[PDB]
Amino acid sequence: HKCDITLQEIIKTLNSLTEQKTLCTELTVTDIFAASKNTTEKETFCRAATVLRQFYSHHEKDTRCLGATAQQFHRHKQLIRFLKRLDQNLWGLAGLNSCPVKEANQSTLENFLERLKTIMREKYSKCSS
């Protein structure tokens, strides 16, 4: 399923994420989009599904992110809800639960999310345009 509405779910969720801030949206993930050797779409997804999943699992109850105020704690609570959802969809479209994250370079969650939001919208374009 390649031009499935799951793409819209991914984009629609990407927007929420990209339009928010936290002390955690600056911590780094593996830049799987720093590769020159490349792969295949479903593996592009399993790899991305992987890094996103390593993050939220590593940062769900992280001290640097839980927050001082209420609006902050709320924000982080929301940040992790979305990561889980964005990831839930990625694994489904990837349909591949094994991943060789061969990369050294790290982006920031936020800058990585933009690139995912971009790749996804290009993937969408090819579905309608």
Added chain:
Amino acid sequence: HKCDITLQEIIKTLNSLTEQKTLCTELTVTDIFAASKNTTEKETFCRAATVLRQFYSHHEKDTRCLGATAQQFHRHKQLIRFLKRLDQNLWGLAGLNSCPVKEANQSTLENFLERLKTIMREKYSKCSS
């Protein structure tokens, strides 16, 4: 030749470009790094060698870029010298002069150059680290 000094030539030139401005560094190229399906390293290069080459050839004597003042015209003159050089190296490492630029989305020359500068530095890391 994969960990050749040509990589340093590419990075070293990428730095000059990325650390400069022009009225032309905002005009758009094809975002070949918006693909999810992916390819192979030498094809990643032929594709990049292609877009860069379409640009300078399309913008060498472009009115929006030639410049009003002297420092401006000089800058554009320099912008195109580097594009030719960065491209000269890419074709050599790509060793492949045929390219299927299947992409719709466009980045800006400047934002595309950053990503190339990044991919290149990751490619370098794997050569020494």
